[PDB]
Design an enzyme around this catalytic site. Structure first.
Site, mmCIF file in Angstrom:
data_model
loop_
_atom_site.group_PDB
_atom_site.id
_atom_site.type_symbol
_atom_site.label_atom_id
_atom_site.label_comp_id
_atom_site.label_asym_id
_atom_site.label_seq_id
_atom_site.Cartn_x
_atom_site.Cartn_y
_atom_site.Cartn_z
ATOM 1 N NE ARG A 199 -2.564 2.873 2.964
ATOM 2 C CZ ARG A 199 -3.013 4.071 2.569
ATOM 3 N NH1 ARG A 199 -2.437 4.714 1.535
ATOM 4 N NH2 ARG A 199 -4.028 4.634 3.226
ATOM 5 C CG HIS A 206 -6.521 2.958 1.812
ATOM 6 N ND1 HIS A 206 -6.602 4.182 1.179
ATOM 7 C CD2 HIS A 206 -5.632 2.218 1.103
ATOM 8 C CE1 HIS A 206 -5.762 4.196 0.155
ATOM 9 N NE2 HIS A 206 -5.167 3.015 0.083
ATOM 10 C CG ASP A 211 -7.892 3.412 7.537
ATOM 11 O OD1 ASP A 211 -8.686 3.929 8.367
ATOM 12 O OD2 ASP A 211 -6.699 3.818 7.400
ATOM 13 N NE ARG A 221 -7.928 -0.663 8.625
ATOM 14 C CZ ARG A 221 -6.924 -0.374 7.817
ATOM 15 N NH1 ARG A 221 -5.765 0.106 8.273
ATOM 16 N NH2 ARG A 221 -7.104 -0.563 6.528
ATOM 17 C CB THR A 235 0.544 12.399 5.934
ATOM 18 O OG1 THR A 235 -0.546 11.659 6.469
ATOM 19 C CG2 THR A 235 0.569 12.199 4.444
ATOM 20 C CG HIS A 294 1.089 5.539 8.129
ATOM 21 N ND1 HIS A 294 1.166 4.381 7.388
ATOM 22 C CD2 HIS A 294 1.612 6.520 7.362
ATOM 23 C CE1 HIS A 294 1.718 4.650 6.224
ATOM 24 N NE2 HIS A 294 1.990 5.943 6.181
ATOM 25 C CG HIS A 321 5.401 9.371 5.724
ATOM 26 N ND1 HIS A 321 5.916 9.004 4.497
ATOM 27 C CD2 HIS A 321 4.103 8.968 5.721
ATOM 28 C CE1 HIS A 321 4.976 8.404 3.788
ATOM 29 N NE2 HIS A 321 3.862 8.374 4.503
ATOM 30 C CG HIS A 379 40.690 2.573 14.188
ATOM 31 N ND1 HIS A 379 41.075 2.120 12.938
ATOM 32 C CD2 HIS A 379 41.339 3.750 14.378
ATOM 33 C CE1 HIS A 379 41.904 2.994 12.392
ATOM 34 N NE2 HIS A 379 42.089 3.987 13.248
#
Ligand SMILES: N[C@@H](CCCC[NH3+])C(=O)O
Ligand SMILES: N[C@@H](CCCC[NH3+])C(=O)O
Ligand code: NA
Ligand code: NA
Ligand SMILES: [Zn+2]
Ligand SMILES: [Zn+2]
EC number: 2.3.3.14
Lengths: 370, 369
Positions: free
Chosen positions: A20, A80, A100, A129, A163, A190, A192, A287
């Protein structure tokens, strides 16, 4: 103490969005056959949900949604829609397990329109949703009053979406925590990754009571994408090793990423979580003395939990066949004599065309399995 | 809202550690001349401090530290030592502007006092740090910082060496440290679990004044807070501050300089400068969001030396893919250049299938303006 009771860090679901969100990736052009491969592999890997591009997007999009629901996968298949009755009808016909409904404030009218669509879906026996786009740049009081209204109607989940990629971890924690106080249902998130916060935001969201997190394989999506699937699992594994190692087939992560990397024509970044060239490496030598403790003291990720054999202690630049053998032995590719021959032929015809890169090692090894 | 008063999100210093943390990167083998190149480029880019591998580490380490302190750079040059007087003597002789004393209860504080006062007597800045701060006993750690604060140091340091800290736990610790000490606070974060940029951000919110970064995040394992990533985050929080303090249009060349030295590709999803960072999907998949894709542009390409978001409809292939990316990067390619690049791009696909990573790789040798 008390808020630890609301934390979902060792009890959450992934909504896998490669099919999606990932379709918004700059170089993603999945055909039916490739979506099916990815859906099957995601299911085998152990995610609870996969989300698909809206079946109203295009014809092929509607067909592929139908095909994927017919595969008999264990995970639940989501899609959705916009908040229109038209779109809802199309969606319920496809055979998805959930829908959704997405809106943007990004006022009295929203509540009414949303009720008709929510009850229609619910009447079809399907999970519903309700989500907002650009939740962190929407008016807070309107947003929360809306979630409250739809909660009173009854939905399965409400969704928060960053978003634009501007939300910060403590800002996410506070919003989710307030949402957790306003609604009685499940909460999906969700995030970004524009500013590097997508994994941190996912984590804080879980701490605050979110129950579902969107991911994408290698994080692919719009711009630089969203919370990476592998990256979230690395974080969540550190928090609860036994929960993550038993729920997911973590040793399958490399093949799952290579499948997507092939389809979208990218190289696995050298610093990719878990599976990148350098993720399980220590520097040996002058190192190694740069930290006080032995390098092996810092192994938050245990290589064999992820299908690998060790951390590689690098004290020199391993070149040619040496670099391939080391990486292949780390990845548990038991390479035959005949395979070792092709690889050093390919690796040469490569370095002769262009000066070799660390990434090329994993690139020439992609075609090989454990 | 009182704690906003303690926030350092638009008032902080970067301690660039490509030449200390970065030397622990699996494929870093910097020679003197390459260190000197990176130090000059970092100084022009506008960071306040660079950190160098301890001059006790090797002969070449010692030599390279001396050479870099003699370059006349504007940024301060730091190094680090163990809590030993011998190491302190070597470090102060090199001409660094600052020395970090790093430790892993009463014996600690006596030795630490000895070393701190010596460094201070040379007129050199002194910082006191702990390794693996988030897996150390909290009360011992804070009592230690308190004691060292009463002695007087320029800074105290928190390091998530193992990469297990979470943003809210970082915020609470720094916030308590800010209440305990009167001095500046530096933070170092490993990225094993994806938290290095978020931890850096939360640390600034809580009052940290200094954040360690590395170019492309290179370091031990998958490294630390990346330089470009931190600036992208801090730019969103205060655009005017970040754009006037750093020369953000030089970020790409800065990364390419390191990428070439450590032989890696610039990841396709790299913050700012990755192939995909300034892209929108056009088409049936632009409809996956409600608003036009161009509504979601938290980073403005022109602030980072670029010309546009690229709106992707089909798969751009061949010179069509090169042209698109070169125009995005403001590389004004001559016809002569466009030719040889088309020659190479095929003389590479004829060896194997092209990644979008390759587009940026063949463009590396090209500069803007
Ligand atoms: N790509 C969409 C996804 C929203 C998901 C809502 N459940 C966004 O970033 O807003
Ligand atoms: N590599 C060290 C750096 C410590 C820096 C302290 N000022 C670590 O990760 O702990
Ligand atoms: Na509630
Ligand atoms: Na104080
Ligand atoms: Zn999204
Ligand atoms: Zn470190």
């Amino acid at each position: 103490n008390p808020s630890d009771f609301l934390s979902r860090v060792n009890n959450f679901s992934i909504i896998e969005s490669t099919l999606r969100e990932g379709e918004q990736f700059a170089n993603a052009f999945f055909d039916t056959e490739k979506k099916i491969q990815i859906a099957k592999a995601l299911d085998n890997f152990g995610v609870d949900y996969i989300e698909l591009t809206s079946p109203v997007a295009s014809e092929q999009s509607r067909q592929d949604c139908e095909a994927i629901c017919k595969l008999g996968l264990k995970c639940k298949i989501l899609t959705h829609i916009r908040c229109h009755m038209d779109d809802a009808r199309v969606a319920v016909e496809t055979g998805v397990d959930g829908v959704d409904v997405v809106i943007g404030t990004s006022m009295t009218y929203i509540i009414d329109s949303a009720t008709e669509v929510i009850n229609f879906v619910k009447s079809k026996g399907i999970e519903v949703r309700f989500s907002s786009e650009d939740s962190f740049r929407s008016d807070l009081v309107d947003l929360l009053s809306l979630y409250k209204a739809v909660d009173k109607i009854g939905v399965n989940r409400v969704g928060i979406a960053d978003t634009v990629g501007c939300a910060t971890p403590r800002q996410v924690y506070d919003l989710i925590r307030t949402l957790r106080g306003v609604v009685s249902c499940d909460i999906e998130c969700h995030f970004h990754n524009d500013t590097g916060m997508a994994i941190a935001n996912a984590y804080c969201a879980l701490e605050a009571g979110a129950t579902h997190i969107d991911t994408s394989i290698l994080g692919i999506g719009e711009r630089n994408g969203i919370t990476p699937l592998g990256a979230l699992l690395a974080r969540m594994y550190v928090t609860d090793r036994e929960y993550i190692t038993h729920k997911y087939k973590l040793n399958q992560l490399r093949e799952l990423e290579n499948l997507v990397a092939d389809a979208v024509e990218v190289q696995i970044p050298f610093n990719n979580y878990i599976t990148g060239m350098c993720a399980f490496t220590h520097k040996a030598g002058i190192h190694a003395k740069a930290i006080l403790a032995n390098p092996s003291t810092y192994e938050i990720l245990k290589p064999e939990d992820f299908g690998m054999s060790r951390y590689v202690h690098v004290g020199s630049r391993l070149t040619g066949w040496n670099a391939i053998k080391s990486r292949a032995e780390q990845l548990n590719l038991h390479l035959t004599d005949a395979q070792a021959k092709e690889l050093t032929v390919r690796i040469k015809k490569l370095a002769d065309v262009r000066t070799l890169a660390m990434d090329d090692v994993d690139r020439v090894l992609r075609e090989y399995h454990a």
